[PDB]
Design a protein around this ligand. Structure first.
Ligand code: NAG
Ligand code: NAG
Ligand code: NAG
Lengths: 49, 35, 35
């Protein structure tokens, strides 16, 4: 659901577009998400292990 | 490289200007080469 | 459906650049069709 479920009804969102709404809150746009989505996943998969 | 994309037509706010005038300028072009 | 709105003439920022070309195109239309 993202962040909406803490402030009302839970609105389901697909997880590829949740990063696009969380890069945009930093100052860099969402253009740098889908262009290199696989290496972001590999940087995220190896981090938790 | 993007996944999950779909096909759709997209518009521009210039055809409310140009495509309301390029047809008008083509109408003037009809009078331009009429004789 | 709004309280206290004021009539005014909102300008268009893309209007006068093409409007200056309108009489330039009409100059070609006058220079070609009439003679
Ligand atoms: C959603 O996931 C399923 C399961 O793998 C997949 O078959 C489907 O293609 C995915 N949807 C899109 C739009 O890729
Ligand atoms: C979009 O259209 C192009 C050509 O018109 C085609 O090659 C492509 O597979 C289409 N993509 C989808 C998701 O329909
Ligand atoms: C604005 O213009 C319309 C139509 O010309 C007129 O009916 C109206 O009284 C004007 N004034 C307003 C909305 O304050």
């Amino acid at each position: 659901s993202g962040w909406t479920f803490g402030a009302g009804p839970a609105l389901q969102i697909p997880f590829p577009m949740q990063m696009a709404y969380r890069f945009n809150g930093i100052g860099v746009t969402q253009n740098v998400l889908y262009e290199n989505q696989k290496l972001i996943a590999n940087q995220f998969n190896s981090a938790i292990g | 490289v993007v996944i999950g994309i779909v096909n759709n037509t997209v518009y521009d706010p210039l055809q409310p200007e140009l495509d309301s005038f390029k047809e008008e300028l083509d109408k003037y072009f009809k009078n331009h080469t009429s004789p």
